[PDB]
Design a protein around this ligand. Structure first.
Ligand SMILES: C[C@H]1O[C@H](O[C@H]2[C@H](O)[C@@H](O)[C@@H](O)O[C@@H]2CO)[C@H](O)[C@@H](O)[C@@H]1N[C@H]1C=C(CO)[C@@H](O)[C@H](O)[C@H]1O
Ligand SMILES: OC[C@H]1O[C@H](O)[C@H](O)[C@@H](O)[C@@H]1O
Ligand SMILES: [Ca+2]
Ligand SMILES: [Cl-]
Length: 496
């Protein structure tokens, strides 16, 4: 469950949040494969409640109606088409698996669902599965409301309804088997692994019992005995009875400490400075690197949901965001996930984004296609951070330096830092209010290297900055504090 199952020399996954299957399939072929992306985390592919108030929110996808592969992202044919086409170009699919719960207990009965399946939350009837009243935790939960009231109580966090979401009885073999059926369907199609949604809300032992029932990965694409990559969503910043480590037996775990702390550092809040990143990783109290799924922001905290707080960096803060993502992708700690977002009409009323619910770009609820602008950015309000040169090139930086040790660290005691990865890559940051101008040991072979932040190598030349490494590995770097991208990165494959 710990191995990503990505192609050798591909080290990141990108969350193509709310993208349609046909768009992802094309994206794999035209972009993700040639740019060296390891894989795609997709939005939940299973049927959900069509919520009309508010109008088709992002969060409707986290209210299951059945396990039919039928969503705003597309139908089963399109899903199968996407996984095949992506695997065929060496790009993996990871499914957002919503298995803790069905929909909200107060959602109306009917066929307001993405495939038109009937469901009745009040009577606990989901006949397209099927689930009945016997399949939920109503009798197991011990709170007055039936919902989670207190995170200091590990039991109710597991047995009670998250925000009123009907809590599946995962202690039952029937329920475990229905979920395993869904996941095995996905595995056989060719899915490489799963983001396990709301993992904190399930007993580690129940997740395990579900995982016990799963097939090995599709043997046309994956070596015999390959197990699905598992990464579990557990928000653990400390101070709760449930710990990220409780889930290590099942796979990797999201390290939410990662983006919270990095955001604070890059913003220079709370007295934090980039020089403090010298011991980034386990030295910052983070989980073991071999279990961490790391990211700057995710689909929840980029809009203030879940954990996060104000420190989280997102596309809205493009300049600091790129630096934070650049730092993540250069540093060996964790397995990296890059966010890919859509723009929504962000509108604050007393410190709250009243539009944090808004779903993907749409015309009357129909998800808009991802259009590609001439310059390879996206139209239709898709942000496509993964296509921003500064991020895409850092994705390849991580591939190039894979397995190389953190080395040649420099800092000025403030916010000017640099480090290398073995003899394969070097990166330099200026987050101070003055110019960073200095000759530094890069650990790299002598030569002319294209800075992959400002530009690209195109056979024999660079479209941006050029860095000159002399015979002793030293190179001069000059980064103004006024630089729009106040960092530079060079690696073995950017050498002329
Ligand atoms: C959105 C988020 O809610 C929960 O998170 C809480 C943390 O667990 C607490 O430690 C504390 O920080 O408060 C948080 C906010 O309530 C929950 O535990 C997470 O699992 C949840 N995230 C996902 C689950 C969903 C339900 O399917 C979705 O709404 C959401 O998009 C998921 O990413
Ligand atoms: O500002 C606080 C920091 O000061 C010190 O320089 C330590 O290296 C670091 O661990 C500590 O957190
Ligand atoms: Ca539960
Ligand atoms: Cl997540």
């Amino acid at each position: 469950q710990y191995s990503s199952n990505t192609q050798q020399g591909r080290t990141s996954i990108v969350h193509l949040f709310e993208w349609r299957w046909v768009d992802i399939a094309l994206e794999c072929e035209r972009y993700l494969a040639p740019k060296g992306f390891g894989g795609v985390q997709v939005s939940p592919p299973n049927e959900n409640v069509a919520i009309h108030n508010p109008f088709r929110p992002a969060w409707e996808r986290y209210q299951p109606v059945s396990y039919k592969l039928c969503t705003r992202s597309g139908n089963e044919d399109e899903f199968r088409n996407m996984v095949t086409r992506c695997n065929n170009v060496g790009v993996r699919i990871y499914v957002d698996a919503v298995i803790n719960h069905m929909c909200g207990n107060a959602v109306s009965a009917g066929t307001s669902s993405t495939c038109g399946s009937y469901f009745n939350p009040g009577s606990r009837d989901f006949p397209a599965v099927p689930y009945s009243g016997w399949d939920f935790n109503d009798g197991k939960c011990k709170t007055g409301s039936g919902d989670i009231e207190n995170y200091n109580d590990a039991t109710q966090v597991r047995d009670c309804r998250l925000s009123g979401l009907l809590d599946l009885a995962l202690g039952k073999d029937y329920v475990r088997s229905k979920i395993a059926e869904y996941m095995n369907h996905l595995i056989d199609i060719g899915v490489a692994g799963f983001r396990i949604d709301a993992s904190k809300h399930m007993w580690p032992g129940d997740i395990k019992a579900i995982l016990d029932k799963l097939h090995n990965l599709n043997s046309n694409w994956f070596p015999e005995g390959s197990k699905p990559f598992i990464y579990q969503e557990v928000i653990d910043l400390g101070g709760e009875p449930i710990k990220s480590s409780d889930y290590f037996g099942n796979g990797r775990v999201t390290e939410f400490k990662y983006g919270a702390k990095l955001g604070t550092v890059i913003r220079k809040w709370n007295g934090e400075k980039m020089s403090y990143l010298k011991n980034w990783g386990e030295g910052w109290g983070f989980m073991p690197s071999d279990r961490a799924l790391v990211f700057v922001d995710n689909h929840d905290n980029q809009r203030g949901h879940g954990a996060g707080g104000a420190s989280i960096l997102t596309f809205w803060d493009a300049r600091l965001y790129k630096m934070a993502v650049g730092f993540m992708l250069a540093h060996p700690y964790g397995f990296t996930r890059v966010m890919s977002s859509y723009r929504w009409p962000r509108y604050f009323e007393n410190g709250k984004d009243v539009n944090d619910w808004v779903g993907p770009p749409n015309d009357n609820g129909v998800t808009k296609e991802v259009t590609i602008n001439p310059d390879t950015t996206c139209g239709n309000d898709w942000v496509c951070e993964h296509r921003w040169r500064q991020i895409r090139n850092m994705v390849n930086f991580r591939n190039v330096v894979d397995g190389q040790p953190f080395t040649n660290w420099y800092d000025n005691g403030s916010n000017q830092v640099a480090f290398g990865r073995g003899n394969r890559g070097f990166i330099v940051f200026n987050n101070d209010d003055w110019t960073f101008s200095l000759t530094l040991q890069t650990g790299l072979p002598a030569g002319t290297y294209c800075d992959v932040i400002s530009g690209d190598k195109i056979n024999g030349n660079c479209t941006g900055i050029k860095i000159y490494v002399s015979d002793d590995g030293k190179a001069h770097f000059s980064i103004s504090n006024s630089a729009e991208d106040p960092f530079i990165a060079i690696h073995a494959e950017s050498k002329l």
